[PDB]
Each structure stands twice: as C-alpha cells, then as structure tokens.
Design a protein around this ligand. Structure first.
Ligand SMILES: Cn1ccnc1-c1noc(C2CCC2)n1
Ligand SMILES: [Zn+2]
Ligand SMILES: [Zn+2]
Ligand SMILES: [Zn+2]
Ligand SMILES: [Zn+2]
Lengths: 69, 69
C-alpha cells in the first residue's frame, strides 16, 4: 500500500543519517573531542584538524560502539 | 499488507536501538570513556562508575551530538 512506501522512506532516511558526512559510504563510529560531534567514519575523522560541523579544534578522536552498528 | 507490518517492526527495532539501555526512555547521547560504549542517556551515564557493557572503569562521560538526535 501507500503506507508501505511511507515506512520504506522513513527507514531509508534514518539509515542515511547514520552514514559519514564526508564519504557517505561508511557508518559513523567516531567522535571529535572535546566538542562531541559524531558525524564521521574513522578514516575521514583521522585527518581533520577542526570539527567540520562547529570548527572547534580536534584534540583527539574517540571511537564509539553504537547499538545501531 | 503483511509488508507494512514487517516495516513497522524494523522501524520500531531501529528506534529502540537509539534508546538508553538502562532507563529505556531517553535517547542515547553519552559515551563512556575510554572504552567507547555509547549506550546511555546523560542521566544514567552520570550514575555508572563502570561500563554496563564491558565493565571497564568510566574515567569520564563524553556528550555526543549525533545526526539521528
Ligand atoms: C565488537 N565490540 C568490541 C567491544 N564492543 C564491541 C561492540 N560491538 O557493538 C557494541 C554495542 C554497544 C552496545 C552493543 N559493542
Ligand atoms: Zn567517511
Ligand atoms: Zn564540533
Ligand atoms: Zn537512561
Ligand atoms: Zn565499555
């Protein structure tokens, strides 16, 4: 039905929101510290000096294990 | 159709995976450091001296800004 199509759309959008903002291909699993933006995979996060969202300096990257992984 | 029911179940399971494993009521937004388990809301994470997933000592809690929030 049309309702099946609407639910398919919500699932797709939620899954897309879990992908790296830089490469769009790998799941987010890294946090820029201390700001806390968790928007990248480990490969894309490794080389950024400043947060791509808020421009704060990245002191380090913390790996995160999310239940959605 | 039955497919609408199946998609409703996938969306429910994905949304449940975003809720605190301790209180089951608030969104996950906190990471236990240094282990990296990100399974609690800020209120439950502030009360645990040990990680509920791996039992490593919590040195500190890092707030995470996720795109799914
Ligand atoms: C593979 N590994 C090693 C240590 N921890 C993990 C792990 N994987 O997924 C998870 C999530 C946290 C809630 C379940 N943890
Ligand atoms: Zn990436
Ligand atoms: Zn930031
Ligand atoms: Zn909680
Ligand atoms: Zn842990």
């Amino acid at each position: 039905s049309q309702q099946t199509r609407v639910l398919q759309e919500k699932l797709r959008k939620l899954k897309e929101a879990m992908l790296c903002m830089v490469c769009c291909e790998e799941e987010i699993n890294s946090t820029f510290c201390p700001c806390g933006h968790t928007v990248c995979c480990e490969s894309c996060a490794a080389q950024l000096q400043s947060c791509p969202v808020c421009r704060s300096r990245v002191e380090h990257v913390q790996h995160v294990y999310l239940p959605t992984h």
